[PDB]
Every structure is written in C-alpha cells, then in structure tokens.
Design a protein around this nucleic acid. Sequence first.
DNA 1: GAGGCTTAAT
DNA 2: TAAGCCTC
DNA 3: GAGGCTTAAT
DNA 4: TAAGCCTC
Lengths: 142, 142
Amino acid sequence: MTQCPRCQRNLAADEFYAGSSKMCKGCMTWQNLSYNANKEGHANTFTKATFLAWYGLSAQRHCGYCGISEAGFTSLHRTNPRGYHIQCLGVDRSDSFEGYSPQNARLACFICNRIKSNIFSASEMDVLGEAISKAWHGRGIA
Amino acid sequence: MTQCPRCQRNLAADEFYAGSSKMCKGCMTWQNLSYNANKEGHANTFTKATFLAWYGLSAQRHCGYCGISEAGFTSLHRTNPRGYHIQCLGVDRSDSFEGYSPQNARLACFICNRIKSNIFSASEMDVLGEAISKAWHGRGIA
DNA sequence: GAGGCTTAAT
DNA sequence: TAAGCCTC
DNA sequence: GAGGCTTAAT
DNA sequence: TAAGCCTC
Ligand SMILES: [Mg+2]
Ligand SMILES: [Mg+2]
Ligand code: NA
Ligand code: NA
Ligand code: NA
Ligand code: NA
Ligand code: NA
Ligand code: NA
Ligand code: NA
Ligand code: NA
Ligand code: NA
Ligand code: NA
Ligand code: NA
Ligand code: NA
Ligand code: NA
Ligand code: NA
Ligand code: NA
Ligand code: NA
Ligand code: NA
Ligand code: NA
Ligand SMILES: [Pt+2]
Ligand SMILES: [Pt+2]
Ligand SMILES: [Zn+2]
Ligand SMILES: [Zn+2]
Ligand SMILES: [Zn+2]
Ligand SMILES: [Zn+2]
C-alpha cells in the first residue's frame, strides 16, 4: 500500500525488500536486467513498462522450472553474490544464446537459473525443474 | 599400458589425460582431493592407496547421480576453473557438512557436483540425477 | 619428479 | 571442484 | 533520487 | 545473476 519512489506505483509490502532498499522488487529487477544485459553483451528488447507488466506482482510469481513461489524461495534464505538474502525471482533467457526479450524470458528462481546455466535447454530444464519441485515439496515448501 | 611416474601403476591410455600432463587421472584426482580438503577445512580420511582402489579405472567410472560414464562426460567438453577440458569424474562429499572419506564419498561428474553444491541432499540429488540422465540419454550420451 | 595455483555461467 | 603450467 | 558495483559452493 | 551500500 506504499508508493515506489522509482516507478511511482502504488504497491503492497510484498513488492518491497525487507532490508534498507527503497526501490520495489520490479524496479530493482529491471535495473539488474539492464546492467546485466549490457555487462554480458546480451540484447534487451524489454522496456521498463513492458517488463513491469511482465513481472507482475509477488504473490503471482512462481519459478517456471520448479514452481516455487517467490515467498517459498525467500524462505530458503539463499544469498546473492554480494551476500544478501534473495527475496525475489529472476529472469531466465530460455535460449541462453539469445538476449532478454518477452519471447525469450522465463521467470526463474536463482537456484534453477544457476543450475540451467548455459548447460541445459529449457526443455531439459523443465525436466530438472520437476525433480527440484519434489525436493521443495519434500521439505514442505510451495 | 604405460606406467604412471607418480603411483608406479601399469595403466591403459584411458587412465591418462589427453594434454601435456604426466600424472594419471587417479594421481591428479588424489592431489586435488588433498589440496581441496585442506583449502576448504574438510577432513580427509582416505589414504592415497585406499583412494586409488576406490577410484578404480576409467571404463568403470560413472557419475553416481546421473549415470554418465567418464568417456560420456569427457565428450561434453566441459572446462575446469583454469580453462581446461575435464576428462575425469570427481568426488562428491555426500553429506556436504562432512569431509572426504570412504563412507561419505560418492563419484560425481562436475556438472552434478556443482548442481548439488551445498543445496541438495544426496537423496534429493538422486532425483535430480535421474532428470539429468534423461538429458544425456536425449542427446545420445551414455 | 613434487605440488601450488584460480575459480562456469548464471 | 580440476588439468595443465610453472617454479622448485 | 540514480545507478555502479561483485561474483555460491562445488 | 541480485539487494543493499556508497558515491554522486
Ligand atoms: Mg538463465
Ligand atoms: Mg559435492
Ligand atoms: Na499487492
Ligand atoms: Na535480472
Ligand atoms: Na529498447
Ligand atoms: Na508466475
Ligand atoms: Na544460504
Ligand atoms: Na538471509
Ligand atoms: Na523429472
Ligand atoms: Na525429497
Ligand atoms: Na585399463
Ligand atoms: Na577431487
Ligand atoms: Na590420514
Ligand atoms: Na562407478
Ligand atoms: Na564448455
Ligand atoms: Na575442450
Ligand atoms: Na526425477
Ligand atoms: Na531431453
Ligand atoms: Na565468471
Ligand atoms: Na567462492
Ligand atoms: Pt536496489
Ligand atoms: Pt596434474
Ligand atoms: Zn518501483
Ligand atoms: Zn526454481
Ligand atoms: Zn598415477
Ligand atoms: Zn552427473
């Protein structure tokens, strides 16, 4: 129910981080996507507006490989490369040879994203995802 | 059918590397295991002799998670962190909290070893392994 | 002949 | 974690 | 308020 | 790849 000072959207608490960040998850994920694309030499055909509509809202976000919810993934307490608790789902370039685009983008948790790496196709990763989903369901996580 | 200058064993060509290394795969893997254990603060209850018997020979080695053969994995042309073609299977500490030991050791290809990381139990990874095995069998690799 | 190294792509 | 390079 | 950063564990 | 820190 707070407004994000970056996108100006009116949003629930679950669209924000638990730490000292003032940006919403959509804005921070968009910033990362942009910086990452340029750093790695990947094209980016999303605009911020299309990305934000694509990214939707926290309670609707689930990893497209293992099915874990954003809240479920948050409860794993995974850390990012700077050492902070990961609290949102990221974006997989389905075809790892292609860039970020509406057609090539798939929502993915950081565990599945790193697993898939540039080793497995999306099709192959669909299969790994079901196996990962069984680990979560085995731990009591949705 | 060549002797390894380090262990003194009489061994087939498939127990040696394709590059400029003079050490056999068993000797190089043992060296890595020792250095890795000390670098990471893991115990190591293998002796070189028990490790070499445990490690066996190339044609018998298959990853304990995905089932890929050492030759199959070699054909993937994966690279190690120094940038060289990986030509042998490595060792997973089943319980990632425990060190290297006959009881805790499992043979694993570098793909499954990195996937399992310290995220999944051996039991959970058994399940991911079957899914990874389907990717290989789908590519025509045993 | 011995053995320290640097660290995927995501 | 993993194979070759480079200094011993 | 904008946006560059550093890089799991194996 | 991903969230907070720190310099603008
Ligand atoms: Mg990806
Ligand atoms: Mg392991
Ligand atoms: Na909401
Ligand atoms: Na991103
Ligand atoms: Na554009
Ligand atoms: Na979703
Ligand atoms: Na963690
Ligand atoms: Na945490
Ligand atoms: Na599966
Ligand atoms: Na399980
Ligand atoms: Na032989
Ligand atoms: Na090893
Ligand atoms: Na000992
Ligand atoms: Na085996
Ligand atoms: Na490769
Ligand atoms: Na190669
Ligand atoms: Na499975
Ligand atoms: Na397949
Ligand atoms: Na890298
Ligand atoms: Na590290
Ligand atoms: Pt941020
Ligand atoms: Pt070597
Ligand atoms: Zn925002
Ligand atoms: Zn996932
Ligand atoms: Zn040897
Ligand atoms: Zn494997």
